[PDB]
Amino acid sequence: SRPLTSEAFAALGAPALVYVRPIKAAEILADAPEGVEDLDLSPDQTLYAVCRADGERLAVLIDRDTAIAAALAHELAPVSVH
Amino acid sequence: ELRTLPVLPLRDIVVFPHMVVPLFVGRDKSVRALEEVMRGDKQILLVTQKNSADDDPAPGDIFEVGVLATVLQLLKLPDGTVKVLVEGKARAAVVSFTDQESYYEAQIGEVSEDDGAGPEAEALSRAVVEQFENYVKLNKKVPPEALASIPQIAEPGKLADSIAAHLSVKIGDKQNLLEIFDVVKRLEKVFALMEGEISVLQV
Secondary structure: OOOOOHHHHHHOOOOOEEEEEEOOHHHHHHHOOOOOOHHHHOOOOOOEEEEEOOOOEEEEEOOHHHHHHHHHHOOOEEEEEO | OOEEEEEEEEOOOOOOOOOEEEEEEOOHHHHHHHHHHHOOOOEEEEEEEOOOOOOOOOHHHEOOEEEEEEEEEEEEOOOOOEEEEEEEEEEEEEEEEOOOOOOOEEEEEEOOOEOOOOHHHHHHHHHHHHHHHHHHHHOOOOOHHHHHHHHHOOOHHHHHHHHHHHOOOOHHHHHHHHHOOEHHHHHHHHHHHHOOOOOOOOO
């Protein structure tokens, strides 16, 4: 098979398909070289990112439900990472 | 017969046989299941989890019927999420999960489907097609491709699964349709689900 070309497959989902995924403490530290909260290093918090279908991060929300709601509120169609 | 293969638990969707679906795969164990399958015959078990909130479901929290699928196409995105286009091939009973802690793995049985051909199967297919034509006026998110192709599906079981995929119904209703192996019963359920105002017929 391989039904699509690489560009088509990377594009696939435009313009509205986004996925929502946990942010690990590792990404948090990269985004904030001048300092993060200790809470960001704990399991007690799990921030979520909403990402375009080609991987580009659109937004960071406090949790999964907020990420899902934020995406719907901006006319996107969110899906999970399985 | 019986086979062991790696599993990908789905958070919040059900993939039917013959559906082709893009998926993003981002949990550690799911990613590892996928890497495994891609070094091999490219085939995985899709099975839906009972609760979409659960991040690390256990076997008791995953349904027991799923779909054997083939990975058609794969792209690792820069953030590590794996974008994959999968194709459901066949319903699969889950016998049990193995002992593997790197990733979920399971033994799966083939399923037989009650099929065929009284005035019933026949009238139900035509009725479900007709109902589907009405249903999509009330649900404008069904792609126009599916509006053209679904009226042409000749095999009742395939017809039921294709409509099932397009219904705006809860996860549990989709998983229930996956578990109905009798095709006449399945078409009857898809008909009922498409009813806009509960029939006076079931009170």
